[PDB]
Amino acid sequence: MDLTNKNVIFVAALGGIGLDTSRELVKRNLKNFVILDRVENPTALAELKAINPKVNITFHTYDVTVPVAESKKLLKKIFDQLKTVDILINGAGILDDHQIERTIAINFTGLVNTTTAILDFWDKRKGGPGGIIANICSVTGFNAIHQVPVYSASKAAVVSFTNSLAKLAPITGVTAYSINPGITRTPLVHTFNSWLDVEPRVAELLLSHPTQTSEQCGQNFVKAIEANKNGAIWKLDLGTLEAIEWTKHWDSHI
Amino acid sequence: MDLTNKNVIFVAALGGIGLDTSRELVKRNLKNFVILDRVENPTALAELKAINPKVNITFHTYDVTVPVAESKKLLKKIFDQLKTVDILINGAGILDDHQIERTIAINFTGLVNTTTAILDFWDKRKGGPGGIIANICSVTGFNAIHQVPVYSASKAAVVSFTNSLAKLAPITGVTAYSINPGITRTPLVHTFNSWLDVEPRVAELLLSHPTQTSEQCGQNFVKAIEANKNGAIWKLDLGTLEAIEWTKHWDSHI
Ligand SMILES: CCC(=O)[C@@H](C)c1cc[n+]([C@@H]2O[C@H](COP(=O)([O-])OP(=O)(O)OC[C@H]3O[C@@H](n4cnc5c(N)ncnc54)[C@H](O)[C@@H]3O)[C@@H](O)[C@H]2O)cc1C(N)=O
Ligand SMILES: CCC(=O)[C@@H](C)c1cc[n+]([C@@H]2O[C@H](COP(=O)([O-])OP(=O)(O)OC[C@H]3O[C@@H](n4cnc5c(N)ncnc54)[C@H](O)[C@@H]3O)[C@@H](O)[C@H]2O)cc1C(N)=O
């Protein structure tokens, strides 16, 4: 993908990884960059507009825990205004294993529902043009942080979901790939709760080992978007970009 | 694990795989077998009670989508009667990718919440005795049936959660392992809904390939329980029992 003149919707663009990815995206001279996030951040919007005044940058309030019909209503209006959308990035996430239901609703159900909603406008069986989805999953979906077992399991679910979307691209017209950061210094990881307080020091201990910056992550995230490889499982860890090979433990044969 | 004179709770014991696993378990001379299921099945219950009349079999209506406080209330009733519980088997699942929220609530959230509740009675940090959890996951949590992406993602989630519970055993005193059937002839897979109807004949297609009986599955399920291997990831496919090796793509270092 050459991002020049493209239209991109980015759910959760203004978080730590989001905003550094967004800084890199607007340098690629998008036509329209539509930010969907829970709370508006006028500082960040001003920063992005200063980086590239040529991009049309818009903001809509969006909480991924709303019902799928509410996501369809919002996406219908964005598609109507823009005519076309090239790429959807699903980035919402929380890390707090004291909040079991909300972790699962935001990190897994919400991503599935935004995806299900945008297929109304993209699915080629409904007359749409197809499209591309980039899901921010996590390396914890391969191998957990077992002190946050619910968070990690929510990310294993969206790694799997994204693998399946890619295999459904011949039917829907919608390709997909996962973006799986390793530990990245953002507000998500500095303080957080472990399940049943199994490890009250989990953030301290985790951040005693090598990390990358959100700037590093964001640079590799835009490289992975430019590679545009349906079914890729991208690892963005310690400043590098690598594709991993999914192990074939079982085959449905269908 | 010697099942002689043990106390076992099985959530979702009277479905296809459950019931054949239940027949095998009550052959092994349990003290108490406690069945927790969303619907009553009077004939299955009566049949089980006849196999080994000396086992004490009790049935409680239980929906895994209730809040954790409600699960704790039910478990308190059971622990007060039995005093000790040796094994919890979490078996609830539905297969219907037209029901996104309820798939995730039953297959993933509900299993996490029953586990979270029973940790109130078992956690060694609170003076509890520890325990053993056997989670019915699925080979689709390794490699999806991509035409039911939400179902398969929910199973990837509980494979992950089970792996992490096992690694938390030194802290909690609760060990865990997953039971992952391949395609097994039950009512679950006879007719079912694919996501966005990507494959309406998904059930017909799936059963055009080698499968196993629920009798074979049940036999291998009780063999896995008797092996009692913390952190095992058991595949129960085509009549065999096989431990799989989890691929190491990333490590948190903690
Ligand atoms: C241990 C953390 C982890 O999994 C590692 C391996 C890594 C991988 C993936 N992630 C994922 O990366 C994405 C961004 O994380 P971050 O580190 O920038 O966190 P941060 O908290 O800064 O950003 C969260 C973003 O999600 C949005 N969000 C939260 N709840 C929402 C809701 N209800 N509706 C809509 N948007 C909502 C926020 O508004 C914000 O845009 C998340 O999906 C997160 O799970 C983070 C890391 C990391 N920071 O190290
Ligand atoms: C494509 C299916 C698949 O994942 C394969 C590879 C295999 C693996 C795991 N499983 C899993 O094995 C377990 C049993 O499946 P089955 O084939 O016996 O299906 P069946 O539908 O006969 O049994 C479902 C059981 O779950 C219980 N249940 C459903 N909703 C509940 C709720 N809200 N609360 C409490 N209990 C509830 C039912 O009452 C019943 O006891 C499920 O976890 C299922 O996901 C089945 C298969 C299979 N039948 O081929």
Short overview:
Two copies of one chain form a homodimer. Chain A has helices at residues 16-27, 42-51, 68-82, 100-122, 149-167, 169-172, 202-206, 214-227, and strands at 7-11, 32-37, 56-61, 87-90, 131-136, 174-181, 184-185, 212-213, 233-237, 240-243.
In total, how many beta strands of chain A? 10
Q: Please identify, by name, the CATH architecture of chain A.
A: 3-Layer(aba) Sandwich
Q: Count of helical segments of chain A? A: 8
Q: Round the Cα radius of gyration of chain A to an integer and report it.
A: 18 Å
How do the SSEs of chain A run, as a string of H and E?
EHEHEHEHEHHEEHEHEE
What's the CATH class of chain A, please?
Alpha Beta
Q: What's the multimeric state? A: homodimer
Largest sheet of chain A: 8 strands, mixed
How many discrete domains of chain A?
1
